[PDB]
Amino acid sequence: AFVVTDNCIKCKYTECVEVCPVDCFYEGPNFLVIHPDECIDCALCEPECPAQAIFSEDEVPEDMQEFIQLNAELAEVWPNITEKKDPLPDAEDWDGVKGKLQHLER
Ligand code: SF4
Ligand code: F3S
């Protein structure tokens, strides 16, 4: 029951997927989501995200509550990703920029 939040958008390092025991990450053009029902809450992906975008559901910041629901719905429509990939080309420029939800691509 972990959740990918805002800082992932435009960064998408994919450092989180290799440690996932149940392969419950799904990828979008510029963001990743965790499938809530598949996730076993092992917490292993959280410290691996360079963007510090992953949070336990009950620890998702108040201002990013929308991502809980978002991960659930997008996990239904995006393809599963199980292998690390190169971060987006300008990940460092966007890492730390707030409100990147406005840049989310379906
Ligand atoms: S908490 Fe564990 S099972 Fe859930 S997405 Fe992260 S690595 Fe995968
Ligand atoms: S930037 Fe996104 S792709 Fe994974 S390593 Fe962090 S949640």
Curated annotation (Swiss-Prot):
Name of the featured protein: Ferredoxin-1
4Fe-4S ferredoxin-type domain span: 1-29, 30-59
MF annotations from Gene Ontology: 3 iron, 4 sulfur cluster binding; 4 iron, 4 sulfur cluster binding; DNA binding; electron transfer activity; metal ion binding
Positions with biased composition (Basic and acidic residues): 95-106
Function comment: Ferredoxins are iron-sulfur proteins that transfer electrons in a wide variety of metabolic reactions. This ferredoxin could play a role in regulating gene expression by interacting directly with DNA.
Cofactor note: Binds 1 [4Fe-4S] cluster.
Spans annotated as Disordered: 83-106
Cofactor dependency: [4Fe-4S] cluster; [3Fe-4S] cluster
Organism: Azotobacter vinelandii
PANTHER family the UniProt entry points to: FERREDOXIN (PTHR42859:SF2), OXIDOREDUCTASE (PTHR42859)
Entry keyword set: 3Fe-4S, 4Fe-4S, DNA-binding, Electron transport, Iron, Iron-sulfur, Metal-binding, Repeat, Transport
Binding-site positions, [4Fe-4S] cluster: 20, 39, 42, 45
Family matches, as Pfam families: DUF3470, Fer4
Domain of life: Bacteria
Positions contributing to [3Fe-4S] cluster binding: 8, 16, 49
Gene: fdxA
Disulfide bridge partners, by residue number: none
